């Protein structure tokens, strides 16, 4: 059997934040990752 090997999904994690002056709420961007791989 021939099997393709695709490297396991990886990418940077960025934190979208307003200033700590404004709020402690943050969003998180998993770069180039489908919303299924993210835990």
């Amino acid at each position: 059997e021939i099997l393709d090997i695709t490297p396991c999904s990886f990418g940077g994690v960025s934190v979208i934040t307003p200033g700590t002056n404004t709020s402690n709420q943050v969003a998180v961007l998993y770069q180039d990752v489908n919303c299924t791989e993210v835990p």
Binding site: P7, F10, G11, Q31, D32
Partner: peptide
């Protein structure tokens, strides 16, 4: 006319080709 997985990522540009076309 104008024509990988080792820790190498390509970030998409902030302005899509559609937005540059609108500009």
């Amino acid at each position: 006319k104008v024509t990988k997985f080792n820790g190498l990522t390509v970030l998409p540009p902030l302005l899509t080709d559609e937005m540059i076309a609108q500009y």
